[PDB]
Point group: D2
Chain length 448, copies 4
């Protein structure tokens, strides 16, 4: 076996022996830590089977004179340039260790208050919440599987964000999770913005499929999908949304459900949907889905900017003084939006299985915010069925997840999902044809 030593991290705190003992190869905690560290070294598909290709990989944590040193057994050779691990990948290994450790030390210490304080704590522990920072963070969302035209577009938006001294917070992995940071690197250099921040959020059951690029200079591993959604919207000062598949619709329905709450009517966070000229049909269909399901009231919470990278960035840049003023109006923090009201329906972690998917309430007779929360979960289930080990396994055992609801809505969701399949948004190129993991059915007398 090839054994490689990773020297201590710039800025990783000393750990105690109690903090790290749960990580020995011995609880499934080691396997989870190993699997996240493997994903960071393996930064070329979304169906987990490279976790059969690195079976002999393992990682050992050593407490030493300057803090933690890591020993890697048989690491991916693509983490190397000229025999050395890329420094940004080195920093990600330490980020993985830090967050796994932190969460495991605070699994002990209402529940809605608990979840928000836990999200705040993880982010604060990661160094992601800079107290003195003026608002400038744009969350970017978009598909992992996008064409070259969409990809170049996300790169040019990132350039435009860079020229305006804005920072980027996004998911991890290929497609729209990687383009803007590459564009921002150039626009930040032109503008001499050396304090740039490219935050990449992930969680343990999706990191292998959507692994962090080395350019991400603040990686944070959140415990689950809902906590990462809540981290995105409490840190965001503005949000740009590119074309994407089910994961990107999920995010859109999460934020629109929150923003329709009357207590959030004065939250100024700008939301811009944007894409190249060729995405015009895609946005017409999305805009129509949203206002047909959630009503015409949802329209006030976002705008659409087609084929104009500088417009999206300018709308974000121009809103930063509005964000500043609103935070001071609420006696809130610039770096973490505590005053944003997030109802428990957006926090409750959702575990996609046949029963939970069939339990979803997709009828028109609810508050729109609540229909949004249920649609968020439906799209979360399609993602899971497609890419999470445990969700793919449910689909293997029992076939597709079945959903039902108002027939008009179900038809519209079924068409949206078929469009995602026709636009190749479900699967990166070069597997076999995509087989849907979902089936829309009509809602179903006793024997006596």
């Amino acid at each position: 076996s090839l054994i490689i030593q990773v020297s201590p991290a710039g800025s990783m705190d000393l750990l105690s022996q109690l903090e790290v003992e749960r990580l020995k190869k011995t609880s499934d905690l080691y396997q989870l830590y190993r699997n996240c560290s493997l994903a960071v070294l393996n930064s070329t598909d979304n169906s987990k089977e490279l976790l059969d290709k690195y079976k002999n990989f393992d990682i050992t944590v050593m407490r030493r004179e300057r803090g933690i040193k890591l020993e890697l057994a048989n690491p991916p050779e693509h983490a190397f340039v000229d025999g050395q691990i890329i420094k940004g990948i080195q920093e990600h290994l330490f980020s993985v260790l830090r967050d796994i450790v932190y969460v495991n030390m605070h699994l002990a210490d209402t529940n809605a208050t608990h979840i928000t304080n836990l999200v705040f704590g993880i982010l604060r522990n990661a160094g992601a919440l800079i107290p003195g920072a003026t608002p400038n963070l744009v969350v970017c969302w978009g598909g992992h599987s996008i064409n070259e035209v969409e990809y170049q577009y996300t790169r040019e938006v990132g350039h435009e964000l860079g020229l305006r001294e804005l920072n980027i917070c996004t998911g991890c992995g290929p497609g729209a999770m990687e383009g803007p940071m590459k564009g921002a690197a150039v626009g930040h250099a032109k503008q001499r913005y050396s304090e740039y921040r490219y935050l990449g959020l992930t969680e343990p059951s999706i990191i292998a499929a959507e692994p962090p690029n080395p350019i991400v200079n603040e990686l944070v591993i959140m415990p689950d999908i809902e906590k990462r959604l809540e981290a995105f919207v409490r840190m965001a000062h503005g949000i740009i949304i590119f074309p994407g598949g089910p994961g990107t619709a999920e995010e859109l329905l999460y934020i629109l459900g929150i923003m329709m709450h009357p207590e959030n009517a004065d939250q100024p966070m700008p939301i811009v949907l944007t894409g190249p000229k060729q995405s015009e049909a895609y946005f017409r269909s999305l805009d129509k889905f949203i206002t047909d399901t959630l009503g015409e009231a949802a329209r006030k919470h976002y705008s659409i900017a087609i084929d104009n990278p500088a417009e999206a960035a300018r709308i974000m840049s121009n809103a930063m003084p509005l964000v500043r003023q609103h935070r001071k109006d609420k006696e809130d923090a610039y770096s973490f939006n505590w005053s944003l009201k997030i109802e428990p329906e957006f926090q409750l972690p959702f575990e996609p299985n046949h029963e939970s998917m069939a339990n979803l309430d997709l009828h028109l007779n609810q508050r729109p915010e609540v229909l949004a929360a249920n649609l968020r979960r439906a799209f979360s289930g399609v993602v899971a069925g497609n890419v999470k080990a445990e969700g793919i396994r449910e689909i293997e055992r029992h076939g597709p997840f079945e959903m039902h609801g108002d027939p008009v809505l179900m038809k519209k969701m079924d068409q949206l999902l078929n469009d995602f399949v026709a636009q190749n948004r479900m699967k990166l190129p070069g597997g076999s044809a995509y087989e849907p993991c979902y089936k829309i059915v009509t809602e179903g007398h006793h024997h006596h």
Copy 2:
């Protein structure tokens, strides 16, 4: 009230509403937070080391406000000596945020006992940013009297200057005298040496901070929960120790480290200890050296040396020991900044609450293991400090007279003469008020 706003200062993270909710003025915690904050503002020579301090600033209050760039502080009627031309000294501003950080962290961490204690001490120091993972060893703990004459003060300043010239940092208590002289010297030596990354760490705890407030020159103030945890923080962070003449607080510290260093499991620990003072302190040191060898045995002498009238040689012993310190931490697979492998037995950690009963119950006999006798003498000196300068201590004395101790008649007489010397040398209390009255009486 005259409201003074204090902007965020130093490295202060955002806090949650839960973290600060008890620091509202309603709350025992608020009063503790308030007292520690007043102490850091009232940092000039009020001589007073008797906690009748507060009564001067009864209308003081502080409000913690969570705002856009983190916490701002609103002070109602702060002491004027915290000000230069109507602005608060920046070092005092940072100390207000250190107090808040440390009060908050300890309060959030209420949930085996020996392991819990050492892990708490580490956690507090880590939270304070006092444990730098990549730093090479260079931290010298300095101990010595809070009430010392000008010749002794000058000498501590010369040692600080020699530590500064050698790129050493200083960790010490708070308050005046030997807690401040060395950092003033070291400011000059470090500037000559261009050592802009100097660290002047000042450790305190809530029941002694009003009596011994941190100089604004301290650039890393840390509030520990109590005296024993401060002791543990000192000796786990130390790479070497310098001890100047002092009174009962300095005896307490010397006995603590000797008791620990005498444990057979610590035989390989390389940390050097140098007792040093000016030429005039020769008799003080002969008498102290004799008290240690007479009580703990000739074996204690192998853990320190004595350097009179030679500031450079004290600093040189520290500097020369650093490579052995490094090697030994590497041999132990231990951290440079926090000595986990040092064995500290429970009798060194168990918090001692001095009152007439606990002082009377101290086991003071010459037939004990010397490390165990050092633990009991540590507790006796801690009790003399508490009776002299702590609020609660000073009260027990007022309402019942001196603390009484008893034990081996031979030990009791040597102890009695040392305490008596501390009184004759003016080490028991800062001068400028009424003559010291013993808070102790040795019975038989």
Copy 3:
């Protein structure tokens, strides 16, 4: 007028009144117009390779103001593409100060030793020679007018240089002058290399045609073409050369003629010619041109790497500790190569007119170094005639520059310039068809 104030941006020292007097519009001196035109060019980056820049912005001016925190600049009617949302890009602001610093320096300070000492003085005063730096500067040369496939390959080589913590030194303008720096911004980001240096060197008679991208973070204005060439080769630790036109040809001949000097036999500076797969035929012909003219002895001084960006960057990276050893063996500086022997024929400033062009010694029958120095001139003549204002008017006055020599050399020559013309290397595309400024008999 639109009037825009520029606050002090760089590491710009205080100046005296004496130092800026000649920049007043009232001074009887040509210096204001030079300073104005260099300042215009930096505000005109991204658009354009003809100096008829001047006609669209006739009403532009710039005023230097010595104030409390040093120099403030006032711009009257600046190009509006230097702006993002009403504000001049910060990199452009710093360039305006770099232009000021170097114009002032050269004006205050103004033979082999004198020339090299001047080049060193200029660089040192610009902050470009960092005394404590370990060798890692790669000079990149290549065509300002290139296709997408060549451009994308230059960005990939840049990304590979970034991942290996190498810095870039290059000319100014579009194409190969800007591609590597874009790639390196991403490779340096992955590698957390925050101290990156993107040096762009230029001179006043080409700056309007080839202006610096805002990404260049160390702009230096040299006084003339030959001093920029000398600056390149004394700072370089390695050299990467992409496909180019006559400007890249000129640079290649300059450095080959110097490296062939017996005194330079132990100068370790790696030279790597590189390009995408499609450039295979370009390089086969460039390779044959060099060896047919300078002889087989030139070949030991460069290699060719096609279709492999990582390889070019790995050769630069692997040579750095060689460069460190050789500088110490010569008791020389890391950051400025004094020990490099540059013969006066490579320093002597060449003024391209029909005469000096005709009086060039292009016989296939000289010292190889001495013929390289002559071809270097010829190529610089073809550049000047294409882009420099004074050159261009010599051609509008007397037609094409005429060159003659050994008919074996002259065929080779002509076919090379003809290949440049057909590969779209002479002129950025989309104006009046390129008509040659040269004629060969």
Copy 4:
């Protein structure tokens, strides 16, 4: 020889061969000997004549252009530059400041304009002129030979300045050139002012006598005394003057002579004379000397604050907004006061000898500015005659420097100089009694 290598320290640029070739040791090189002697003084930082050389006859220094710039080889350096066998870093930086500035002045080898521009050029090359910095620099002047009460007082003043985020620019050497910076090191640390600047200005013929302390973080070597004076007053945003001897008197006359020029009536820079309680008589007598000689008009240009270290610092701090507004009004730099009028009488370098001291115009019937210029030169000669090698030689071979002028003036000067001798300001303690290097001597009939 014992050869100790010094690596690069501070912000020194690469130098060319041309720049350093004249610094090579040869039989005839006057420039090498000057460089060697300035370097040796920085390494030797306890009497005050320049026969301190003699202990270190075998010292030499070699400049070597190498990969990361210049490396220095010292032969037989003094032992007090070292702590535990390594050279104190501030001293290492000083060796390079000495090299930097000697090379610069030699490479830069109209007249009034010329001198001012050279002064600026030297300071800018040394990095002493920070373009973006808000005004905060206080020049401190004061005696090199002072008792413990006066020294502790200077230290208390430096602490107050430190607490106010003010910087210090001073001469080099012991006494009042040393105390304020030790006091400010403490004050600035309490205030977290890590960007502190302690500027020590010196010149080749005095640096041996008054060697810079390692705590100086910006050492600058000016070409001569007059250019150091111009450097002080152009960089100053305020001035504090402690009690001192003839060198301190020379500085006060220089600044008063300048500040009385009609073109300087708008200049806002404050001047505070200050010292401990026991210096009341000293300041009474100094203030009377000033107003008797230069006139009642001179009094408006300074104030006196006895026994109050915080007040002297407060005056400096409260004058900053005015100094900033006045610089902006004159379209001048914060860091270099070009607007200040300095007449040639203050710039012309003065070479003290028996003939130039006898040619001094010390008559009360002339412009008070030119009287001040002339008195400035006279104290300068007493300084030369006591501490400068060359001056000391003039006195060894020809006896004291004679001066004459108005008997009204001559008497005041005589008394003042007498007061300096009796207050032990001429000579640091140790050897024998001070012997005066001056004599004050006694046109009509027609």
